[PDB]
Amino acid sequence: GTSHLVKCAEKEKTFCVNGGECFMVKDLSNPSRYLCKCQPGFTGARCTENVPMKVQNQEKAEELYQK
Question: Where in the numbering of this chain does the EGF-like domain appear?
Answer without folding.
Answer: 4-48
